[PDB]
Amino acid sequence: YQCHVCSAVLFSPLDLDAHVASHGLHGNQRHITEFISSWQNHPIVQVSADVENRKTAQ
């Protein structure tokens, strides 16, 4: 899978539907900022500092 707006790689169709909401597309909330570079494969998300058990998120 992949989003043709920001060129990010997803895995599930529900994942794509939840991802396009950050750009403004609908379908049929934990992140604060979401970046992605164009020369490498390494997204960087940023989540609030009080939440528990963060899985590799700044």
Partner 1 sequence: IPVERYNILTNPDAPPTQIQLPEVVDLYNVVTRYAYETPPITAVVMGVP
Partner 2 sequence: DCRISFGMNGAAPMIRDETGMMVPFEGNWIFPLALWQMNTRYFNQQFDAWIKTGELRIRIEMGAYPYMLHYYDPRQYANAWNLTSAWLEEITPTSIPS
Partner 3 sequence: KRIPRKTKGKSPATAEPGTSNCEHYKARPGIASVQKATESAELPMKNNDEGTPDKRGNTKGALVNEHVEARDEADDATKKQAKDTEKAKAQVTYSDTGINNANELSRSGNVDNEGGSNQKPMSTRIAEATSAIVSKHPA
* Residue nearer to partner 2 on the CB measure, 29 or 40: 40
The Cα 43–Cα 2 span in angstroms is 13
User: What is the C-alpha to C-alpha distance for residues 13 and 19, in angstroms, rounded to an integer?
Assistant: 10
Q: Binding partner 3 by CB under 8 A: which of 28, 38, 40, 53?
A: 40
3 annotated ligand binder: yes
Contact of residue 53 among partner 1, Zn ion, partner 2, none (CB under 5-8 Å per partner type) = none
For residue 50, how many other CB atoms are within 10 A of its CB?
A: 5
47 is in an annotated binding site: no
Q: Considering the rule CB under 8 A, would residue 14 count as an interface residue with partner 3?
A: no
The annotation status of 51 as a binding-site residue, yes or no, is: no
Question: Of 34, 36, 16, which is closest to residue 26 (Cα–Cα)?
Answer: 16
